[PDB]
Amino acid sequence: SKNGRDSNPKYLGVKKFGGEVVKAGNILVRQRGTKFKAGQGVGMGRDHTLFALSDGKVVFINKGKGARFISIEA
Amino acid sequence: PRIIVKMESSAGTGFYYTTTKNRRNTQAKLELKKYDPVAKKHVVFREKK
Amino acid sequence: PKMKTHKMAKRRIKITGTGKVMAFKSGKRHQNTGKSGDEIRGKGKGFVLAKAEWARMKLMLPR
RNA sequence: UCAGGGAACUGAAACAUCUCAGUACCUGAAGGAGAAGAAAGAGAAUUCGAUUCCGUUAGUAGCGGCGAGCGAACCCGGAU
RNA sequence: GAAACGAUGACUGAAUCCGCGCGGACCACCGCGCAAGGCUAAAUACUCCCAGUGACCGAUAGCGCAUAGUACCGUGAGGG
RNA sequence: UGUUAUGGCGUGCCUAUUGAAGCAUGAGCCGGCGACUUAGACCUGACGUGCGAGCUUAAGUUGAAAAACGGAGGCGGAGCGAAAGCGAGUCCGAAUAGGGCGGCAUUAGUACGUCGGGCUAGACUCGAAACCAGGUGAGCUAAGCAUGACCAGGUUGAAA
RNA sequence: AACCGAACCUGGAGAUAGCUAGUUCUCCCCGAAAUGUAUUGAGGUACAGCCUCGGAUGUUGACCAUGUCCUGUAGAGCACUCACAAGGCUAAAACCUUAUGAAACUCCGAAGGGGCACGCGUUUAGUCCGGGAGUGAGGCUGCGAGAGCUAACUUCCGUAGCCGAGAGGGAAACAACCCAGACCAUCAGCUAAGGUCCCUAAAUGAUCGCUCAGUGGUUAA
RNA sequence: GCGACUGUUUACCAAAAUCACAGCACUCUGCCAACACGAACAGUGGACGUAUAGGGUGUGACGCCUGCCCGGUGCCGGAAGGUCAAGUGGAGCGGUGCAAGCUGCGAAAUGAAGCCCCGGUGAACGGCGGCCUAAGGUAGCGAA
RNA sequence: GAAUUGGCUGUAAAGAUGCGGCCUACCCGUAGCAGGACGAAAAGACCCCGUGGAGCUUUACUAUAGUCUGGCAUUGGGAUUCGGGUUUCUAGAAACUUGGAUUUCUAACCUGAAAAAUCACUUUCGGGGACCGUGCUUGGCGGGUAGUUUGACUGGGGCGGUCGCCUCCCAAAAUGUAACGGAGGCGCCCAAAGGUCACCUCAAGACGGUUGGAAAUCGUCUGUAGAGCGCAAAGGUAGAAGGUGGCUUGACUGCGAGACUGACACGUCGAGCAGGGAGGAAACUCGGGCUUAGUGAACCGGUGGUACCGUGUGGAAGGGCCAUCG
Ligand SMILES: [Mg+2]
Ligand SMILES: [Mg+2]
Ligand SMILES: [Mg+2]
Ligand SMILES: [Mg+2]
Ligand SMILES: [Mg+2]
Ligand SMILES: [Mg+2]
Ligand SMILES: [Mg+2]
Ligand SMILES: [Mg+2]
Ligand SMILES: [Mg+2]
Ligand SMILES: [Mg+2]
Ligand SMILES: [Mg+2]
Ligand SMILES: [Mg+2]
Ligand SMILES: [Mg+2]
Ligand SMILES: [Mg+2]
Ligand SMILES: [Mg+2]
Ligand SMILES: [Mg+2]
Ligand SMILES: [Mg+2]
Ligand SMILES: [Mg+2]
Ligand SMILES: [Mg+2]
Ligand SMILES: [Mg+2]
Ligand SMILES: [Mg+2]
Ligand SMILES: [Mg+2]
Ligand SMILES: [Mg+2]
Ligand SMILES: [Mg+2]
Ligand SMILES: [Mg+2]
Ligand SMILES: [Mg+2]
Ligand SMILES: [Mg+2]
Ligand SMILES: [Mg+2]
Ligand SMILES: [Mg+2]
Ligand SMILES: [Mg+2]
Ligand SMILES: [Mg+2]
Ligand SMILES: [Mg+2]
Ligand SMILES: [Mg+2]
Ligand SMILES: [Mg+2]
Ligand SMILES: [Mg+2]
Ligand SMILES: [Mg+2]
Ligand SMILES: [Mg+2]
Ligand SMILES: [Mg+2]
Ligand SMILES: [Mg+2]
Ligand SMILES: [Mg+2]
Ligand SMILES: [Mg+2]
Ligand SMILES: [Mg+2]
Ligand SMILES: [Mg+2]
Ligand SMILES: [Mg+2]
Ligand SMILES: [Mg+2]
Ligand SMILES: [Mg+2]
Ligand SMILES: [Mg+2]
Ligand SMILES: [Mg+2]
Ligand SMILES: [Mg+2]
Ligand SMILES: [Mg+2]
Ligand SMILES: [Mg+2]
Ligand SMILES: [Mg+2]
Ligand SMILES: [Mg+2]
Ligand SMILES: [Mg+2]
Ligand SMILES: [Mg+2]
Ligand SMILES: [Mg+2]
Ligand SMILES: [Mg+2]
Ligand SMILES: [Mg+2]
Ligand SMILES: [Mg+2]
Ligand SMILES: [Mg+2]
Ligand SMILES: [Mg+2]
Ligand SMILES: [Mg+2]
Ligand SMILES: [Mg+2]
Ligand SMILES: [Mg+2]
Ligand SMILES: [Mg+2]
Ligand SMILES: [Mg+2]
Ligand SMILES: [Mg+2]
Ligand SMILES: [Mg+2]
Ligand SMILES: [Mg+2]
Ligand SMILES: [Mg+2]
Ligand SMILES: [Mg+2]
Ligand SMILES: [Mg+2]
Ligand SMILES: [Mg+2]
Ligand SMILES: [Mg+2]
Ligand SMILES: [Mg+2]
Ligand SMILES: [Mg+2]
Ligand SMILES: [Mg+2]
Ligand SMILES: [Mg+2]
Ligand SMILES: [Mg+2]
Ligand SMILES: [Mg+2]
Ligand SMILES: [Mg+2]
Ligand SMILES: [Mg+2]
Ligand SMILES: [Mg+2]
Ligand SMILES: [Mg+2]
Ligand SMILES: [Mg+2]
Ligand SMILES: [Mg+2]
Ligand SMILES: [Mg+2]
Ligand SMILES: [Mg+2]
Ligand SMILES: [Mg+2]
Ligand SMILES: [Mg+2]
Ligand SMILES: [Mg+2]
Ligand SMILES: [Mg+2]
Ligand SMILES: [Mg+2]
Ligand SMILES: [Mg+2]
Ligand SMILES: [Mg+2]
Ligand SMILES: [Mg+2]
Ligand SMILES: [Mg+2]
Ligand SMILES: [Mg+2]
Ligand SMILES: [Mg+2]
Ligand SMILES: [Mg+2]
Ligand SMILES: [Mg+2]
16 A cells, blocks of 8 residues: 655745736746636636736736736736 | 457548547447548548448 | 668658758657647647757758 | 678667677788779760779768768869 | 558560650559669778887786797586 | 084875775886877868959879869858748748848858867777687597506405 | 587577666866656656857846735634534424534635836846767755654655755864855955864953852653 | 495595486387488498387386376377468459550468367376365375 | 785775884794685586577477378279260260279289298299389378577566556756656547638526425526546637538649758748638638647558550560558
8 A cells, every 4th residue: 555656746836926917828827726816817727727818017906806807007 | 258359440431540439338339430531521430440 | 871760751852941950849749639730730840950960960961 | 802601798878779880800802002993874854974092072861769970972173 | 551652482474666664552634764784993801911100018017929829628619 | 505413393105085194006126118100182160371242273284303284063142941941031821910022230261281179990008708710739638439558465265 | 529408619609688888188167957748657768957169139137116916824613514512492493692623625715936017227138040978876954744653864745945966164073064165375364153261263351140050961741 | 314235436625325326117110110310312320230229208226006187288089160372363443555465463262281169188287275277195205 | 926924993996914103023934724815626516697598398480200181193905883084876876985993803013832941943832912112293291300489678587577659747938858757648539529611608606496405407696717629638718729500622733942850761830822612701721630649660562543564576464652551
């Protein structure tokens, strides 16, 4: 039963951070479910990674615990 | 042997195969869909073989 | 003298261009495939990067 | 030089095909040389014109566990 | 290998100039050539031997030997 | 300069190593011999020379107290593609999304030479256990064969 | 034919040798690695990562400040899951007062850490194109953890510094500890760690106390 | 205790309980024998021998004796059926020719030995067990 | 190695004449002894390592001497029954067979005796006999022989375990991070568990209720959730991804601006463009599934298209491209 098992690192985390200029198609956070939630200007991939539609300054919205959003300001 | 299988699709007079077959568990003999070969139109795909 | 390694030629590694080494895209050869339709298509023509010096002298005369 | 026989270490980062190599070695025959030589050819121009040697073709065309690696000929320029 | 052509070991086994062989499975056309008889100098290789030469040695170098296949070792092949 | 007394200080050399005065390797001493080379019209760079949108010869011929000749051929000059092929365009494709590429930065190339690397070949020098080929050995020793030789003296007491 | 699990001699033959050993003149400049992936791989190689040389660019580098977002460790807490201490209530789960533990618990949650902008400020490295590498056995201490007996000059990761390649002073001696990074000369001066009775450079220093054990100069219940 | 016995061995650390040995047993072998050396339709050895002989294997004077298990493997027989190569066969499928013809494949049926399959065989390889396998220790011995 | 070579105790790579402190010791020999100089000798035979070797073994792999076997050749007439061939002729049979098969024959061939020992010759002669032997080929057997293979991690090796993928601690509040550390899953599923359109909202407890009564089923009230999501956990989820129906396939072809991640090679997410669909009244959403596991480069080949190559030309064999399978 000696159990030497484990699983390769998943480079999950917040990629682009607050006040970074971004581009269309940049991947802005990696997550399992929706810790951070889509928000305006921002799509969300099939694996729940949200990502930019438009270019510009980035996000910052976090009052709802379990209700936090990313966004893009032209 | 096996349950689920691979199965070729053949166009109503086209060519284009598409070989994404699913279970023999409940589709005991059924296998018809629709998608376009080389003519632009979506057409009927009998997935017999 | 100096052979070309004929494992380079009709294999991926076109030598061509401004001296840079194109190669192909690999997985899902004709080994079996269900899998996605946007990967079965995205297997056309790649091009490598930090190995080129090795690839070049495989085939420096561009066969 | 030609012929009758014909290895293995080795490389393939193991080893069978493969390579090493028709190499080493043994044997036969002959001479100052020898072999080869006068197209049922090369080859794609209805071109060429016995053989041998050198340059180049060209590491091209190809061969190959299509792996390691092996590798021509024609045209053309010379010696005769 | 789609593997032609030459090559023999075994068994078979044609045709004549409106004929025979090839042109890389094979076919037609179109081309190239006359097999199963022989000889054939020169351009090529090599260095026991001789001559000349050397950004070759000069006595632990240079051939093993400034001479020796000697002394010496071995039953020998052989080494030296 | 030579040599001394006395004070202070002071753990051979190399190699191999996390770590050597090491009680870890090597070595008695001195002399001499002794190890990154060569090759090829091979690749790829640095530096230098000649000629430059063009550069250059190979085999050879003729001359040699000397070198000229020799364009066969090699490198630039067009790219994209599996290829046929098109061609400053090309490939994928039913057109518009891309890959590579020319423009613009036209970095200018080529033949030599010296050098740094690479490849191939003993490839920095020395060191196997082993594998294969053709020979030499049964004058030692293991055996066989043919022909010869040898065994003081004493005790025991079988068949018939 | 004085070494027979396969004789001796000569030849292939300079077999092959990811293995050992050895690799010689001089000064100057820079200066590493023992990490990560893959490997019939583990003491070998390939690609990265760190060195150097040349070219291009030209502060893009470095600390430090301000602004902004990201985080669930320390601590803490019991509101979920598990464990769990004394009572009441009752057919005992549950429920109430009191009370706790947690790497795989979290109603909370720092210091720190990272990304971006700015340079509001001092510095001087950076990046890209090429030629040459070596390295891929690391070790010790403090801190943070697992494995271990809360052993080990143990082992395996993280993190800083030293040795590795670091001479000099201190620690009696002493790679790692303390101070400090050796261009060359001087029979000149100041300090650091650490010292000032004699070996042994320098107060038998000054003022308050303490210990009469050689405690100093060897653990505890 | 072991081996019956004389004898033989590790030249150079083992002389023995090792080897051989008389005796016994299985099997093979009809004579250009089996078997063995051999490039060889050569020649030899067996052997100028012929089954009371020769080869091979294992036991090991002599005495009393040598038990159970043919499933597996080996071997000897069987040889209804299954499988199986070259060859014979060439129905049919294609190219290429205007055609004649040339040409690439190519079946069914029939083709040996062998193996599957069935019997036997132990002085054939062997096996005689753990609180189903083919059977499970006959005599004799036993802390060797 | 060179030596001008003492004792204790301490340190140093951990057993010190040689480093530190302290003790002892005038210079040099001769006869003796055997504690030390990790004394000498053989670059450890144990052990581990090397993708080293060699001897041997077998039901490891692969060949092969040897040997058995079918066909053909040497190799020949005959009689006999002949599945059949051809011209023969009042379903039919004589010239004849292409053969197979017992049977039989003697000129091949083998072998033996006779003044001529191996061989050659006649043989009144003898026996075997188209078998054997031999030559090519087919298949079997073939440790007799031969060339080789026989992984790695590993608190020494072996034995046991373990080799890829996913989840959570460890992992030190960014990503990352080892251990033969601690836990647990995958090598699939789903013709609907997918697209869209529309509509419902779950556990759990309390009172009351037909056989059930701790728990079936209904009914009321509580009810950020204490459920569920195909499976492992973690995140996430109440405006749903959960539970239910209607239509249908976007479980699409041609592409891919930009980024996450990796030494590569792979891997991930993807707005938007075209052809054509699907659901919706529309806006709009569709290029599989809440997400993270359900996986294999290359080589060689099978199957379907395409008409690029195809060696004098025109084809075809063969090859390439696209799709798929192993
Ligand atoms: Mg286990
Ligand atoms: Mg190209
Ligand atoms: Mg070999
Ligand atoms: Mg090899
Ligand atoms: Mg071989
Ligand atoms: Mg020679
Ligand atoms: Mg000769
Ligand atoms: Mg002669
Ligand atoms: Mg000519
Ligand atoms: Mg022909
Ligand atoms: Mg021929
Ligand atoms: Mg032709
Ligand atoms: Mg000289
Ligand atoms: Mg001499
Ligand atoms: Mg001398
Ligand atoms: Mg000599
Ligand atoms: Mg002598
Ligand atoms: Mg003599
Ligand atoms: Mg002195
Ligand atoms: Mg050590
Ligand atoms: Mg030291
Ligand atoms: Mg010493
Ligand atoms: Mg020493
Ligand atoms: Mg050593
Ligand atoms: Mg010594
Ligand atoms: Mg050249
Ligand atoms: Mg040449
Ligand atoms: Mg461009
Ligand atoms: Mg040059
Ligand atoms: Mg290199
Ligand atoms: Mg070599
Ligand atoms: Mg030999
Ligand atoms: Mg003798
Ligand atoms: Mg006498
Ligand atoms: Mg007497
Ligand atoms: Mg001897
Ligand atoms: Mg002697
Ligand atoms: Mg030997
Ligand atoms: Mg050598
Ligand atoms: Mg050789
Ligand atoms: Mg080797
Ligand atoms: Mg410096
Ligand atoms: Mg990996
Ligand atoms: Mg390593
Ligand atoms: Mg590197
Ligand atoms: Mg620079
Ligand atoms: Mg920067
Ligand atoms: Mg800056
Ligand atoms: Mg805590
Ligand atoms: Mg509160
Ligand atoms: Mg500034
Ligand atoms: Mg570089
Ligand atoms: Mg260099
Ligand atoms: Mg390491
Ligand atoms: Mg470490
Ligand atoms: Mg513990
Ligand atoms: Mg340690
Ligand atoms: Mg080191
Ligand atoms: Mg340092
Ligand atoms: Mg120091
Ligand atoms: Mg010091
Ligand atoms: Mg000191
Ligand atoms: Mg100390
Ligand atoms: Mg220390
Ligand atoms: Mg030091
Ligand atoms: Mg002072
Ligand atoms: Mg001070
Ligand atoms: Mg003083
Ligand atoms: Mg005082
Ligand atoms: Mg006893
Ligand atoms: Mg005896
Ligand atoms: Mg002896
Ligand atoms: Mg002897
Ligand atoms: Mg003795
Ligand atoms: Mg005979
Ligand atoms: Mg005889
Ligand atoms: Mg016995
Ligand atoms: Mg018995
Ligand atoms: Mg007793
Ligand atoms: Mg100590
Ligand atoms: Mg001591
Ligand atoms: Mg001392
Ligand atoms: Mg001293
Ligand atoms: Mg003595
Ligand atoms: Mg050793
Ligand atoms: Mg081997
Ligand atoms: Mg045979
Ligand atoms: Mg055969
Ligand atoms: Mg063997
Ligand atoms: Mg076998
Ligand atoms: Mg191992
Ligand atoms: Mg983290
Ligand atoms: Mg951290
Ligand atoms: Mg690590
Ligand atoms: Mg643990
Ligand atoms: Mg829904
Ligand atoms: Mg509609
Ligand atoms: Mg889209
Ligand atoms: Mg096909
Ligand atoms: Mg053609
Ligand atoms: Mg075709």
